Design a protein around this ligand. Structure first.
Ligand SMILES: NC(=O)C1=Cc2ccccc2OC1
Length: 165
């Protein structure tokens, strides 16, 4: 199962790790993707997860968008996890660098509650522009299911653990 995670709360765990390498190792039931409404997996976690699937995740995502239209900011969809997980939960956190409502971050984390255990990144962190300390706070105050957070950046991981209330 998941190893080397620091326990933050009864249900939230965290590790300084590459989510692609973590997914390839564990092969979780659910890996969360930090998606945009168009499921265009260009950069950040999305670009990395998609590249690990040899672009199979983008091919599948484009078929999903052609059929269903775009997701909502704060929304999600369950697609295949490919070589990374059984499923990929594509969750759209608000992108602050696109003027999107940071209040949507709680709605985005609520999607995790539909899955008993998930491997996930901090929503709206990184290239999405939100404060990762705020994202972790929203995560532990919203998610009730078991969430194993992979934080790529070592220095950010240390700051998150050392500042966690
Ligand atoms: N496996 C990889 O190539 C990467 C992992 C990663 C992890 C988090 C965010 C962005 C990333 O981009 C590159």
């Amino acid at each position: 199962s998941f190893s080397g995670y620091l326990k933050l709360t009864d249900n939230v765990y965290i590790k300084n790790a590459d989510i692609v390498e973590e997914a390839k190792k564990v092969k979780p039931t659910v890996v969360v993707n930090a998606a945009n409404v168009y499921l265009k997996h260009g950069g950040g976690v999305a670009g990395a997860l998609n590249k690990a699937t040899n672009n199979a995740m983008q091919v599948e995502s484009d078929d999903y968008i052609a059929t269903n239209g775009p997701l909502k900011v704060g929304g999600s969809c369950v697609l295949s996890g490919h070589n990374l997980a059984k499923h990929c939960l594509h969750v759209v956190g608000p992108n602050v660098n696109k003027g999107e409502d940071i209040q949507l971050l709680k709605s985005a984390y609520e999607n995790f509650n539909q899955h008993e255990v998930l491997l996930a990144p901090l929503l709206s962190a990184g290239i999405f522009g939100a404060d990762p300390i705020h994202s972790l706070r929203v995560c532990v105050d919203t998610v009730r299911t078991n969430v194993y957070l992979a934080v790529f950046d070592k220095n950010l991981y240390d700051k998150l653990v050392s500042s966690f209330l």
